[PDB]
């Protein structure tokens, strides 16, 4: 598991800054966020 689940495992994008920054529901559940993709 990446950190969240919205993004694969090695999203370079989160690897910096956890790009999704939901804060609360950071998980986001939706398998596939646009920021990391
Ligand atoms: Cd994420
Ligand atoms: Cd990510
Ligand atoms: Cd993350
Ligand atoms: Cd993301």
Residue 21 is assigned to a ligand binding site:
no
Residue 6 is assigned to a ligand binding site:
yes
Give the DSSP H/E element, type plus range, for residue 16: helix 12-17
Residue 18 is assigned to a ligand binding site:
yes
Q: Which residues contact 25 (CB under 8 A, 6 or more apart)?
A: none
Which experimental approach was used here?
A: NMR
Query: How far apart are alpha carbons 24 and 37 in whole angstroms?
Result: 21
Q: Of the bound ligands, which one is closest to the alpha carbon of residue 17?
A: 3
The torsion region of residue 17 among left (phi > 0), alpha (psi -120 to 50) and beta comes to alpha
Q: Of the bound ligands, which one is closest to the alpha carbon of residue 27?
A: 1
Q: Please give all residues whose CB falls under 5 A of ion ligand 1, grouped by chain where several chains appear.
A: 4, 6-7, 20
Judge contact between 32 and 6, C-beta under 8 A. Answer: yes
Judge contact between 33 and 11, C-beta under 8 A. Answer: no
Query: How far apart are alpha carbons 31 and 24 in whole angstroms?
Result: 17
């Amino acid at each position: 598991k990446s950190c969240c689940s919205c993004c694969p495992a090695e999203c370079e994008k989160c690897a910096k800054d956890c790009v999704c920054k939901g804060g609360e529901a950071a998980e986001a559940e939706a398998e596939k966020c646009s920021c990391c993709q």
